[PDB]
Amino acid sequence: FPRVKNWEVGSITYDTLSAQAQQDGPCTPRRCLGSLVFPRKLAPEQLLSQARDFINQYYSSIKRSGSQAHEQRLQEVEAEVAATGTYQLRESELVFGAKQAWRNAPRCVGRIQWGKLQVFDARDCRSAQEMFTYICNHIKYATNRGNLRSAITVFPQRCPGRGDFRIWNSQLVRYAGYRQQDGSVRGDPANVEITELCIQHGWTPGNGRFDVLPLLLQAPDEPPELFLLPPELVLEVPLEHPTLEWFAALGLRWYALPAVSNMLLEIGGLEFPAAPFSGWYMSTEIGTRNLCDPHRYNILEDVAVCMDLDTRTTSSLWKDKAAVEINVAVLHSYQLAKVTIVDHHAATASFMKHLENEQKARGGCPADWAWIVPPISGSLTPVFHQEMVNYFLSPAFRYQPDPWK
Amino acid sequence: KFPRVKNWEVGSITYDTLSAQAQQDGPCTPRRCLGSLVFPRKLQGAPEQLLSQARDFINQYYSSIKRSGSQAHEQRLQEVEAEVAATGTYQLRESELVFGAKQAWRNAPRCVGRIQWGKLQVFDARDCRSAQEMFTYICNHIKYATNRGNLRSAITVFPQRCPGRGDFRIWNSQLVRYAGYRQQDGSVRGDPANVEITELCIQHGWTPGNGRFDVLPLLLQAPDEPPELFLLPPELVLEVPLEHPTLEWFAALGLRWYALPAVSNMLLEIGGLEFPAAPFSGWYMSTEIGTRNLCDPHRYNILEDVAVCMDLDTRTTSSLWKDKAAVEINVAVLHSYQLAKVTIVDHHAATASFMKHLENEQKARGGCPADWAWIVPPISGSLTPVFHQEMVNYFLSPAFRYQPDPW
Ligand code: HEM
Ligand code: HEM
Ligand SMILES: N=C(Nc1ccc(CCNCc2cccc(NC(=N)c3ccoc3)c2)cc1)c1ccoc1
Ligand SMILES: N=C(Nc1ccc(CCNCc2cccc(NC(=N)c3ccoc3)c2)cc1)c1ccoc1
Ligand SMILES: C[C@H](O)[C@H](O)[C@H]1CNc2nc(N)[nH]c(=O)c2N1
Ligand SMILES: C[C@H](O)[C@H](O)[C@H]1CNc2nc(N)[nH]c(=O)c2N1
Ligand SMILES: [Gd]
Ligand SMILES: [Gd]
Ligand SMILES: [Zn+2]
């Protein structure tokens, strides 16, 4: 078992949970590929073993291992798989599986929250219009006027003979990115492709920097259908800075609800290609990545010039000073708007507690160091000094191919 | 296959074909990645194996100088084969030593400074016989490398390990280290990283100081002898008092650091030969001092002191008081080293040069071993280009390796 050391405190643990890793990552003894964004490519006997492992996980979690109920469920799944090629989760299993998939997500620093997840069962959904109803109710619930609640809506599983439900958008709220003739982008460069797809499917584009995109929702064996989110459903936070009064004149904003909509939820061998989940933001996602990445909104140099910093030389650390003030603006602004947000110090401190909890509960915790350590102030947070073991457990959230490629 | 490597800021793709030549194995498997572990397990302690590494190294060298298959290449292979058959080991020509030292630096996956790898002064101390002579070589190294603040990269190579004879070892992890004194309540005065070496110095007859920045003596070990204590002449040890360009009280904190980072506890491996004492030096990247050495909770841990002096709100994390204090400490380090005319590189400039290194190496060797977690600076990670660069980590030889402490 891997020996895992915390270098700030000197404490050592062994990750025995890693021995239960259900899938291969990209590393080998000859070379580590832990820094790759995409670590992977993108039946009945294999389905059964994954189903049985999941059922065993479920009955262990409720302290009913070996019960008549545990045995009946194993037999039932085995017989349903033999008779139909697949099986159906019970509602309690779906809830357990969604929470486990979150708990198992190595790149998520928010997992101290994993037990608190509202699971909306949309496995009866039959149309894109109904998907939009479920999505709008999810957004309303999760937003909760700014007191954000973690939630997942689970649409019907993949099944043979039938196309997938898919949400083409990578998140439920995305700002349009409009590519300009000189190669530049107006709006969010991360969303140029989904923006062009929306336009190709009839959306009349805006021309602002923070135009909320419509949803492209795909029902089985149907082209995607375009749905506009009612603007009163999309809570947004205008960004200002508590002591840099011109900052508000930048016209920057971000949305309250991070709701990831393009990942595949895998439970017990069953695949849910549409299972959007939302929580709340860690401020560096907005203030550091979304606003200061050179290939995103890239506001760093404008902010530094407005702060009267000397941007001619790197050694004044104008980039660092400007980035800190932008993160302050995000934190101050979400708090002023009474929208749940967590700074990276509080978040990483809670993740350390989560690692402690998971060592006792499961003997380890899969974690992706490069994603857990925040993008500013890395070694000022406890996770920087914490060795981590990255491995794939199921249930899981997984990347999946885009449905237009 | 060959790992596909993407830069996510610009979208450019490379394939790392060099990783297919990786010699030793790392700690990762398909089941779980251990890339974040400081010690990728292992450590240190047949003519066939040595001859195999020697030939691969000689072949590497003669390829690098465009003389593969030449008469000189064949003659050198035969010399090495004949030396190992006669003596069980062999001797590097001085040109091969220099090449080997530079390649070991080039191959170091955790070094962000490798754009400099071809500029390395190599002092050949393989004739060294005594700890006293080791001290003379070390002082000359420090004097050359310090160069009155105009730091020059250098390595001094002491005699190789050989059967039936102890190693030369420098016990200190760096040539310049500040003492760490354990207090009666368990706290540390000075650098907590150096408590163990400080106590070893006291054990071997060093009269300790009681300051926060006492430069430690050197414990130098000649083969089969106990380590010998040597005091560095204070005029050899250039130090920079830390001040801040605008925070006038910062100077009164009495913080300082030394000019010369000179790593003295790593093993240099070239063509199967092992040099357990081969201290190397360059110059600092400022985050090493301002972020890690001074702000790590288990190092000097001064961040909250500085935040107090800055009148920051320190009982709400979301004021980002830690981040603001950290930046000003890094500003103070940069300002102070530039004021003292001591070479230093900020983390923006260093990571930008490392991207250029990656580009040079892709053309030169088809790849570059890099350890993402160590290349990305400990503050402002995604503000630097390396954050957005996928990297492949693997072990090439020649190499600098960790080795067990000699005691
Ligand atoms: C409740 C507050 C939460 C916070 C503060 C939080 C924080 C984060 C952050 C900062 C990341 C890195 C994202 C990036 O850099 O792109 C992340 C990733 C992730 N989160 Fe959480 N999260 C929360 C809730 C959730 C929930 C409710 C789920 C699912 C039920 C979830 C599943 C994931 C997954 C699967 C990833 C990996 C995404 C990827 O690989 O691209 N998180 N989270
Ligand atoms: C010339 C300026 C140089 C700069 C700015 C530089 C910068 C750095 C930094 C920031 C690290 C990480 C150290 C840490 O965080 O503890 C590092 C590691 C390293 N450097 Fe360089 N370096 C330079 C020169 C050199 C030279 C001359 C050598 C050897 C000949 C070298 C070999 C290494 C090695 C082997 C490591 C890995 C250390 C470890 O694994 O503990 N560097 N360097
Ligand atoms: N897919 C492409 N790259 C690409 C770019 C970025 C990513 C990271 C996606 N993470 C978004 C995300 C995921 C999970 C959590 C968050 N945050 C939250 N707080 C949160 C969200 C829900 O609950 C909490 C945010 C992944 C891939 C690509 C390739 C070509 O074009 C585009
Ligand atoms: N020593 C312990 N841990 C420990 C602590 C630190 C390390 C890594 C040390 N890197 C020092 C280093 C190495 C290479 C480069 C630099 N910087 C430079 N710019 C530089 C130096 C030479 O040329 C440029 C600095 C490794 C292990 C320990 C273990 C148990 O108890 C205590
Ligand atoms: C190349 C590198 O893996 C990539 O930029 C990663 C690094 N760590 C990250 N960490 C988080 N949380 N989010 C990210 O998008 C990334 N990107
Ligand atoms: C646990 C983790 O690997 C450890 O804290 C690493 C992270 N990255 C680092 N990067 C550098 N340059 N130096 C370090 O000491 C570390 N420490
Ligand atoms: Gd102001
Ligand atoms: Gd005062
Ligand atoms: Zn790995």
DSSP string, B31-73: S-B-TT-SS-S-----HHHHHHHHHHHHHHHHHHTT-TTSHHH
- The reply to whether B114 belongs to the active site is yes
> If residue B13 lies in a helix (H) or strand (E), which one and from where to where?
strand B13-15
Question: Where does residue B174 rank: exposed (0-12), middle (13-18), buried (19+ CB within 10 A)?
Answer: buried
Which residues partner with B263 through β-bridges?
B174, B280
Distance from CA of B215 to the nearest CA of A (A): 24
What are the distances in angstroms from CA A400 to CA A34, A50, A403? 19, 19, 9
The reply to whether residue B297 touches residue A5, judged by beta carbons under 8 angstroms, is: no
Residue A14, token pair as written in the block: 């062994």
Q: Resolution of the coordinates in A?
A: 1.9
- The reply to whether A111 belongs to the active site is yes
Residue B22 contacts residue B394 (beta carbons within 8 Å)? yes
Best substitution site from A37, A99, A107, A272 to test ligand 1's pocket, by max atoms within 8 Å of Cβ? Answer: A107
Atom 6 in ligand 4: which residue has the minimum CA distance?
Answer: B193
Distance from CA of B389 to the nearest CA of A (A): 8
Cα–Cα distance for residue pair B175/B279, rounded to 1 Å: 8
Cα–Cα distance for residue pair B92/B87, rounded to 1 Å: 14
Residue B123, token pair as written in the block: 């002092």
* C-beta pairs of B401-404 under 8 Å, 24+ apart in sequence: B401/B44, B401/B266, B401/B267, B401/B268, B401/B269, B402/B39, B402/B43, B402/B44, B402/B266, B402/B267, B403/B43, B403/B44, B403/B265, B403/B266, B403/B267, B403/B276, B404/B43, B404/B44, B404/B45
Q: What is the DSSP string of A48-68?
A: HHHHHHHHHHHHHHTT-TTSH
Distance B136 CA to ligand 4 centre (A): 24
Is the previous residue joined to B398 through a cis bond, with omega within 30 degrees of 0? yes
Residue B377 contacts residue B347 (beta carbons within 8 Å)? yes
Which residues partner with A151 through β-bridges?
A118, A278
Nearest to A32 among B26, B346, B380 (CB): B26
Q: Which residues of A touch B329 (CB under 8 A)?
A: none
CB of B36 shorter than 6 A to ligand 6? yes
Q: Which residues of A touch B297 (CB under 8 A)?
A: 8, 385
The reply to whether residue B377 touches residue A378, judged by beta carbons under 8 angstroms, is: yes
Supply the DSSP symbol for A155: P
Which residues partner with B399 through β-bridges?
B269
Residue B124, token pair as written in the block: 């050949």
Quick check: helix, strand or coil at residue B280? Answer: strand
**Identified catalytic residue from B96, B105, B106, B111:** B111
Non-local (6+) Cβ contacts of A400 within 8 A are A42, A262, A263, A264, A273
> If residue B349 lies in a helix (H) or strand (E), which one and from where to where?
helix B347-365
Residue A386, token pair as written in the block: 């914490």
Non-local (6+) Cβ contacts of B135 within 8 A are B218, B220, B230
What are the distances in angstroms from CA B81 to CA A330, B89, B90, B159, B263? 66, 9, 8, 20, 33
Q: Which residues of A touch B10 (CB under 8 A)?
A: 295
Which residue's structure tokens are 């985050």? B287
> If residue B267 lies in a helix (H) or strand (E), which one and from where to where?
strand B267-270
Minimum-distance ligand 5 atom for the alpha carbon of A37: 3
What are the distances in angstroms from CA A19 to CA A386, A390, B29? 20, 11, 12
B231 at the A interface (CB within 8 A)? Answer: no
Q: Closest-lying ligand to the alpha carbon of B176?
A: 4
Pocket of ligand 5 (CB under 6 A): A 35, 37, 370-371; B 8, 387-390
Question: Where does residue B21 rank: exposed (0-12), middle (13-18), buried (19+ CB within 10 A)?
Answer: middle
> Which backbone phi and psi does A133 adopt, to 5 degrees?
-60, -50
The reply to whether residue B376 touches residue A380, judged by beta carbons under 8 angstroms, is: no
B1 at the A interface (CB within 8 A)? Answer: no
Cα–Cα distance for residue pair B257/A127, rounded to 1 Å: 66
B351 at the A interface (CB within 8 A)? Answer: no
Q: How many residues does chain A have?
A: 405
B376 at the A interface (CB within 8 A)? Answer: yes
Nearest to A274 by CA among A162, A172, A157: A157
Nearest to B326 by CA among A377, A304, A292: A377
- The reply to whether B288 belongs to the active site is yes
Distance from CA of B310 to the nearest CA of A (A): 15
Atom 1 in ligand 4: which residue has the minimum CA distance?
Answer: B193
Distance from CA of B285 to the nearest CA of A (A): 11
CA atoms within 13 A of residue A29's CA, in its CB half-sphere: 4
Residue A151 contacts residue A117 (beta carbons within 8 Å)? yes
Q: Which residues of B touch A369 (CB under 8 A)?
A: 35-36, 373
Cα–Cα distance for residue pair B96/B275, rounded to 1 Å: 14
Q: Which residues of B touch A4 (CB under 8 A)?
A: 37
**Identified catalytic residue from B76, B283, B321, B328:** B283
Chain A residue with minimum CA distance to B286: A315
CA atoms within 13 A of residue B28's CA, in its CB half-sphere: 27
Cα–Cα distance for residue pair A98/A106, rounded to 1 Å: 15
Q: Is B28 annotated as a binding residue?
A: yes
Cα–Cα distance for residue pair A70/A55, rounded to 1 Å: 8
Residue A64 contacts residue A55 (beta carbons within 8 Å)? no
Cα–Cα distance for residue pair B358/B392, rounded to 1 Å: 11
Chain B residue with minimum CA distance to A30: B25
B326 at the A interface (CB within 8 A)? Answer: yes
Nearest to B381 among A349, A378, A391 (CB): A378
The reply to whether residue B32 touches residue A346, judged by beta carbons under 8 angstroms, is: no
CA A232 to chain centre: 23
Q: What sign for the dihedral angle of Cα B318, A353, A338, A297? A: positive
